[model samples]
Target: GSMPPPQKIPSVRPFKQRKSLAIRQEEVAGIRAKFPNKIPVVVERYPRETFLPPLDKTKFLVPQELTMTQFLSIIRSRMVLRATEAFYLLVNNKSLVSMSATMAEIYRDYKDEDGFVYMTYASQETFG
Candidate 1:
């Protein structure tokens, strides 16, 4: 499927006008001594905030009972060539993002012929 469209934002130019009146040197010095740090000032009429909901987790596969070796093998085989692959643990529907070792490491861990295969692909999922 195609990706979602990007959002648009309006731009505004800042005001360049300055007051032409001058104050006494003593008054300016007194004000500077009283307040060493200048307070931040902002224009009253400005854009408001637009709060949006957080993005939902994009699930590529369902959870099933599997051993450690089985899980490792599935990820190793599915990873794209020359690209790094990572896995996560979903606890109570929340994803815990983490980086796993490369495909080579996974292959080394479960290289025996009797190793189990837990996740067999039945269908494919894609974004964008």
Candidate 2:
């Protein structure tokens, strides 16, 4: 085969030097701007008909970017009721949360027009 004389050769040029901290601060700011800061979350455990004791205000300013698992751990542990049975989290009254859904994404649907992300935990379907 004859030589195909023209080709686009990929190339890279080395940097002149390292940038100083103050200069890099701008870069950090730019990266930080890409994500929203932590958000407030308030989960209310609806009391059941079985005389299961109610809980204090379950509230925290959880990070908006928290993983679904991390979000779940906080939501599940905020309160307990081994006074007899057990406690865990469920969305819309039944299914477990999406394993890959970010906390902010879940919060967006449940949170109201203003204020914290409002979530509910249940010991039973019956509202107290």
Residue range 1-128, candidate 2, lDDT tens digits: 89787685534433342435564444334433653576555565654534344454455555667866676665545445444343445544444657677767866665544434556566545443
Q: On a 0 to 100 scale, what is the lDDT of residue 53 in model 2?
A: 49
**How accurate locally, in lDDT, is each candidate?**
0.28, 0.54
Give candidate 1's error at residue 68 in angstroms.
2.5
The local distance difference test score of model 2 is 0.54
Colliding pairs, model 2:
none
| Candidate 2 minimal-lDDT segment of 10 residues | 10-19
Candidate 1 wrongly placed segments (more than 4 Å):
1-58, 82-128
lDDT of 1 by residue, 7-79 (tens): 8643443333222224223433443366433211111111121121111211112122333344444444444
Backbone clashes for every candidate come to: 0, 0
| Residue 128 CA displacement from its true place in model 1, Å | 36
The residue pairs found clashing in candidate 1 are none
